[PDB]
Amino acid sequence: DVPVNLYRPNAPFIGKVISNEPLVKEGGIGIVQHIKFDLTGGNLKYIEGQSIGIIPPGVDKNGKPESLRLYSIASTRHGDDVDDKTISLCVRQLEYKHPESGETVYGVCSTYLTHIEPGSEVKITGPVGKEMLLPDDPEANVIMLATGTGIAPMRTYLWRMFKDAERAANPEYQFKGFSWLVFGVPTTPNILYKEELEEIQQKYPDNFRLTYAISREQKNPQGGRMYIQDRVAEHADQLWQLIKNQKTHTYICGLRGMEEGIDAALSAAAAKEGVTWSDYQKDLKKAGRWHVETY
Numbered sequence: 001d002v003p004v005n006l007y008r009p010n011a012p013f014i015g016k017v018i019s020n021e022p023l024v025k026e027g028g029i030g031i032v033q034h035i036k037f038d039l040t041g042g043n044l045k046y047i048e049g050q051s052i053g054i055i056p057p058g059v060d061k062n063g064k065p066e067s068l069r070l071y072s073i074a075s076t077r078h079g080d081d082v083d084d085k086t087i088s089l090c091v092r093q094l095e096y097k098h099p100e101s102g103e104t105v106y107g108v109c110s111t112y113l114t115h116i117e118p119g120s121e122v123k124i125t126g127p128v129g130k131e132m133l134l135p136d137d138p139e140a141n142v143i144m145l146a147t148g149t150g151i152a153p154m155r156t157y158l159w160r161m162f163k164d165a166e167r168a169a170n171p172e173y174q175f176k177g178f179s180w181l182v183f184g185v186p187t188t189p190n191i192l193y194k195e196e197l198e199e200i201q202q203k204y205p206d207n208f209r210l211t212y213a214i215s216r217e218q219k220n221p222q223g224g225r226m227y228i229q230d231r232v233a234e235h236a237d238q239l240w241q242l243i244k245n246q247k248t249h250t251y252i253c254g255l256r257g258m259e260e261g262i263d264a265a266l267s268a269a270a271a272k273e274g275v276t277w278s279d280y281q282k283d284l285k286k287a288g289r290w291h292v293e294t295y
């Protein structure tokens with residue numbers, strides 16, 4: 001039921017860019033684009049939680065073809081327009097430092113993707129991934145811990161759960177459980193999909209909770225910048241009590257390093273009832289209830 005590797009690097013699907021919109025509002029840090037591709041002309045099917053590969057043009061410094069980079073799929077299986085003809089991605093442009101040869105280095109595939117024009121053809125492989133899939137259980141609780149572009153798999157879940165058009169299109173999945181997104185970003189204009197997430201929380205105040213950790217605008221109790229691990233420690237007892245429910249699934253997505261502060265918070269909460277979190281967590285992974293994709 002999970003499509004995997006319908007297209008591979010040796011014979012990719014050639015899709016076309018339909019649109020390339022900016023997500024970072026003025027006053028925000030960096031460039032993050034929402035890119036939609038046209039899938040008509042092939043048979044790329046995918047579901048929520050998966051990723052595709054993009055093969056950028058050109059050669060590296062040794063003269064070899066650039067290889068694929070993976071990107072979380074940011075649309076549901078139906079695409080943003082709910083017509084089963086497109087796929088979307090949420091791509092941050094990577095750029096960095098001086099002590100790494102020269103001046104500013106720009107990431108190859110991410111610079112290529114964030115500046116790509118409508119009508120352009122893109123080499124697409126996949127889909128791949130079975131680690132971030134959503135259960136078809138409409139009464140599941142879903143905890144979502146995202147930073148930056150890790151919002152991408154979370155958006156596919158929430159849209160499937162809460163978009164009017166999705167609910168009419170998926171008669172077998174009418175979500176009636178509870179979901180909680182904790183979303184860590186640097187500024188308020190860096191809240192990707194802010195307007196759509198907050199509209200969801202207004203229509204479903206009992207089925208969706210939205211918490212932000214905004215580091216240039218909020219301080220944690222210790223006077224430092226507010227990061228997602230600070231918000232998780234604030235609500236550690238609550239999150240622990242939801243995680244004990246047999247129905248609860250936890251998703252963690254974002255840049256590497258966020259995992260250690262989430263564990264230390266849930267560790268202190270579990271200990272209060274004589275549970276060693278690192279052992280409870282192994283059982284959760286085994287059961288398919290603890291989902292992690294960091295990079």
Ligand SMILES: Cc1cc2nc3c(=O)[nH]c(=O)nc-3n(C[C@H](O)[C@H](O)[C@H](O)COP(=O)(O)OP(=O)(O)OC[C@H]3O[C@@H](n4cnc5c(N)ncnc54)[C@H](O)[C@@H]3O)c2cc1C
Pocket residue numbers: 051069070071072073090091092093094096097100106107108109110111149150152293294295
């Ligand atoms: C499963 C998965 C899902 C992903 N999903 C997404 C997504 O939804 N959105 C998204 O934007 N990205 C996503 N990424 C990351 C993405 O695949 C690419 O790694 C990223 O876009 C950068 O690729 P590039 O081609 O731009 O950079 P490259 O040109 O390959 O540059 C990256 C290389 O430069 C170096 N480098 C990077 N950062 C620094 C730094 N701060 N200091 C020093 N050196 C550094 C490292 O050697 C790194 O290998 C995902 C990755 C994985 C594995």
